[PDB]
Amino acid sequence: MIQRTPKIQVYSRHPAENGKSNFLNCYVSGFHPSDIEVDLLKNGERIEKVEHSDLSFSKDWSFYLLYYTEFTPTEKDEYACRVNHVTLSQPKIVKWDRDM
Amino acid sequence: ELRAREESY
C-alpha cells in the first residue's frame, strides 16, 4: 500500500519566556499508517510521561497527533522532538526553533 | 450521539 511520511512541528503553547511555565508541543501529521513513535527531548534525553491527543485523521485520511508536556524554558536548555515511522529509515529529530 | 446497528463491510 501507499505510505505517507509525517510532517513535524515543534513549538510552545504560549510565547516562550525563560523561567515561566509553558507547554512544549510536537505536532505530527500527514502520515499513514497510524503507528508512530514520538519522543520529546531535553538536552538530548527523553522526557518522561509525555502525553498525546487521541488519534484522528484529516480529510485525505492521513493521521495527526499532538504530543505535549508542561515545561519551563531556560536560556540553556535545548528541546527537540524525535519521530520514527515506517517511512523513516532513521528517527528524525526536529529542534525546537526558539528563534521565530 | 453515535449511529447504532452498523452493517459490516
Binding site: 512541528q9 501529521s29 485523521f57 | 453515535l2 449511529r3 447504532a4 459490516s8 463491510y9
Partner: protein, 276 residues
C-alpha cells in the same frame, strides 16, 4: 454560523499482536468531545469536553455499547476486506470512516456525510443524496451491493436527518459559551534577515478558534501565493490554533508587503505590516 458534528473511526489489524484495535473520536466543529479505545483497560465512551459531562448514565452506557459492538463489527469488516483484496493474514490493514452532519445557523440539516477508506485510500462513500453509494473499485462494489441489499443508505439517512442534527443542536446549546464563541487570532509580524540582499517577513496568528483562517501576503496589493510559505494550522493544546505565513523580501522593500488576516472572531479583516 454553520456547525458540524463528525465521528472518526480507525480500525487497525495487527496480526500476532491480538485483535484489531478500534478507536472512535467525536468532534463538534474543531472541538473533540468524546473518545473510545478498545485497547483501554476498561473500554468506555469517555468525555473529552466539559459540556458533554452533563449527559447522564444512559447516554454513556448506550454510546459505550455501540462502540463495543463496533469493535466486533469492524473486526468482521477487516476480515472481509482482506478477502476482497486477496490479501494474506500477515499484513496490518486499516479501515477509516468519517460520518456526520452539518447544520446551518438555524439548525437545519445542510449536508450529511459517510465516507470510508482502506489502507489510506478512498473505499466507499455515501453520496450527498444520502441514498446511493460511490465505490472506489470492484472490492468496494462488494460492500456496496451488501449495503444496498441491507438498505444501509436508508439507515444512514435516518440517522443523519434525525439523531445527528438533534444531538448536534443539543451539544451546541449545552456548550454554547465555547462552541459558539470565535476567538480571534493574536497577530504580529516578525523580520528575520537572511543576507544583505533579503529578509524573511513572517506573519503570525496565535490563539484563534475555530481553526478556519486565511493568512496571506500581498506585494503591492497582489497575492504572493506561490512565494508564501504557509505552515499547516496546528493545535496549541488549549483548544486554540496557530499558523504562520512567510515570504522572502528584498531588503528595503518591506513596506510593499502586507499581511491580511481573515477569521470569524475578528471585528474586521486585518492588514498588518512590518513595524520596525
Amino acid at each position: 454560523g454553520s456547525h458540524s458534528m463528525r465521528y472518526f473511526y480507525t480500525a487497525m489489524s495487527r496480526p500476532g499482536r491480538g485483535e484489531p484495535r478500534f478507536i472512535a473520536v467525536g468532534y463538534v466543529d474543531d472541538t473533540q468531545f468524546v473518545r473510545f479505545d478498545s485497547d483501554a483497560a476498561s473500554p468506555r465512551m469517555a468525555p473529552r469536553a466539559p459540556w458533554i459531562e452533563q449527559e447522564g448514565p444512559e447516554y454513556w452506557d448506550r454510546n459505550t455499547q455501540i462502540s463495543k459492538t463496533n469493535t466486533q463489527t469492524y473486526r468482521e469488516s477487516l476480515r472481509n476486506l482482506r478477502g476482497y483484496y486477496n490479501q494474506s493474514e500477515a499484513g496490518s490493514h486499516i479501515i477509516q470512516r468519517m460520518y456526520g452532519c452539518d447544520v446551518g445557523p438555524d439548525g437545519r440539516l445542510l449536508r450529511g456525510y459517510d465516507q470510508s477508506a482502506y489502507d489510506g485510500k478512498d473505499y466507499i462513500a455515501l453520496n450527498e443524496d444520502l441514498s446511493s453509494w460511490t465505490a472506489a473499485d470492484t472490492a468496494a462494489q462488494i460492500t456496496q451491493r451488501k449495503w444496498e441489499a441491507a438498505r444501509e443508505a436508508e439507515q444512514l439517512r435516518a440517522y443523519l436527518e434525525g439523531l445527528c442534527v438533534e444531538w448536534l443542536r443539543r451539544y451546541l446549546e449545552n456548550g454554547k459559551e465555547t462552541l459558539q464563541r470565535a476567538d480571534p487570532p493574536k497577530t504580529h509580524v516578525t523580520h528575520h534577515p537572511i543576507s544583505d540582499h533579503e529578509a524573511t517577513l513572517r506573519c503570525w496568528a496565535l490563539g484563534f478558534y475555530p481553526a478556519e483562517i486565511t493568512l496571506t501576503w500581498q506585494r503591492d496589493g497582489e497575492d504572493q501565493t506561490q512565494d508564501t510559505e504557509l505552515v499547516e494550522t496546528r493545535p496549541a493544546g488549549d483548544r486554540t490554533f496557530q499558523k504562520w505565513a512567510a515570504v522572502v523580501v528584498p531588503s528595503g522593500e518591506e513596506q510593499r508587503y502586507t499581511c491580511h488576516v481573515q477569521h470569524e472572531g475578528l471585528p474586521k479583516p486585518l492588514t498588518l505590516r512590518w513595524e520596525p
